[PDB]
Swiss-Prot record:
Localization (cell): Cytoplasm
Domain of life of the native organism: Bacteria
Function recorded in the entry: Essential cell division protein that forms a contractile ring structure (Z ring) at the future cell division site. The regulation of the ring assembly controls the timing and the location of cell division. One of the functions of the FtsZ ring is to recruit other cell division proteins to the septum to produce a new cell wall between the dividing cells. Binds GTP and shows GTPase activity.
From-to range in the entire protein, with total length: 12 to 315 of 390
UniProt keyword list: Cell cycle, Cell division, Cytoplasm, GTP-binding, Nucleotide-binding, Septation
GO biological process, one term: protein polymerization
Organism: Staphylococcus aureus
Entry similarity comment: Belongs to the FtsZ family.
Subunit structure comment from the entry: Homodimer. Polymerizes to form a dynamic ring structure in a strictly GTP-dependent manner. Interacts directly with several other division proteins. Interacts with FtsA.
GO MF annotation, one: GTP binding
GO cellular component, one term: cytoplasm
Annotated residues for binding of GTP: G14, G15, G16, N17, N18, G101, T102, G103, E132, R136, D180
Name by which UniProt lists this protein: Cell division protein FtsZ
Main localisation: cytoplasm
Length: 308
């Protein structure tokens, strides 16, 4: 008997549901998508197969009007419908934009329900742009703290970091796609780890060990070819221009390297050393390797870091 973990991605509120819509468009298989919102108009446009309208008696079908208490009460009163949607999950990713009413208030309730049901629960949330003002930032910070209390692991993306990767003309929607990559590639990295039996094998139990009840996390992937490919891919995997939690200080890392038949012992050590040197801690590594012959000169390094 083999194990095949059930993964679910849950968008909560406006930003979370747009991230879900964009991920569905990008294409993802063997992942269930759930869309949760107070805003019935936006939920009607969701591409997810499971849509949950919360708080209709409270908001009359509108959003939360920037009030986190409304988001929280909305979720609590739809608990049974949220549980039904999560049922069967082995891992749940909850994504939401903090600072509004629905995400801030409802996302921690959703995450708490998932964890109480035994699922490995990961949050990936944004903080608002500074141009949205102090009050939005303060509401968002309270949401982040509530999320921390309710998840196994949390990845925070300050939206201000998007201003570091655009030029004056980059479309807003293109910047948003860059932030979407954090969650999408983290999910895909776990999917790929579960689906393949590696020459040095890691599986969902290793994911649980690295992520259960840990706090902040980093999830990254790097791909490189040619000379110094392993160092370059490892540096890319831990590079964090959009992340609140960098690699620095990590005390546990799951690292998987995938390459073709040319994958060398020496370069696997090089990659492992990059990660641990950048952590600047004594890192408890869980190391894996997959030989994919279809790959020629490409190497892929996946990292999950916790223990901050
Ligand atoms: N990166 C990103 N940030 C978003 C997006 N949509 C909303 N935001 C951020 O999320 C915050 C909450 O917006 P929203 O999710 O629409 O509020 P809610 O629906 O009331 O929870 C905003 O203040 C923005 O900082 C998105 O698509 N991408
Ligand atoms: Ca595996």
């Amino acid at each position: 008997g083999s194990h095949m973990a059930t993964l679910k991605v849950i968008g909560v509120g406006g930003g979370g549901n747009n991230a879900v819509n964009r991920m569905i468009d990008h294409g993802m298989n063997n992942v269930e998508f759930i869309a949760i919102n107070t805003d019935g108009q936006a939920l009607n446009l969701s591409k997810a197969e499971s849509k949950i309208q919360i708080g209709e008696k409270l908001t009359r079908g509108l959003g939360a009007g920037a009030n986190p208490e409304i988001g929280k009460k909305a979720a609590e009163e739809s608990r049974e419908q949220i549980e039904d949607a999560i049922q069967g999950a082995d891992m749940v990713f909850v994504t939401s934009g903090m600072g509004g009413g629905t995400g801030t208030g409802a996302a921690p309730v959703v995450a708490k329900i998932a964890k109480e049901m035994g699922a490995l629960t990961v949050g990936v949330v944004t903080r608002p742009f500074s141009f949205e003002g102090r009050k939005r930032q303060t509401q968002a910070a309270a949401g982040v703290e509530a999320m921390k209390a309710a998840v196994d692991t949390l990845i925070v993306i300050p939206n201000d970091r998007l201003l570091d990767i655009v030029d004056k003309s980059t479309p807003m929607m293109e910047a948003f796609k860059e932030a979407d990559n954090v969650l999408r590639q983290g999910v895909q990295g776990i999917s790929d780890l579960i689906a393949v039996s590696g020459e040095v094998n890691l599986d969902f139990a290793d994911v649980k060990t690295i992520m259960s009840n840990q706090g902040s996390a980093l999830m990254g992937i790097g791909v490189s070819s040619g000379e110094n490919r392993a160092v370059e891919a490892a540096k890319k995997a831990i590079s964090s221009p959009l992340l609140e939690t960098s690699i620095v200080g990590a005390q546990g890392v799951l690292m998987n390297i995938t390459g073709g038949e040319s994958l060398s012992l020496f370069e696997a050590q090089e990659a492992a050393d990059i990660v641990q040197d950048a952590a600047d801690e004594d890192v408890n590594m869980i190391f894996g390797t997959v030989i994919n012959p279809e790959l020629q000169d490409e190497i892929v390094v996946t990292v999950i870091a916790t223990g901050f």
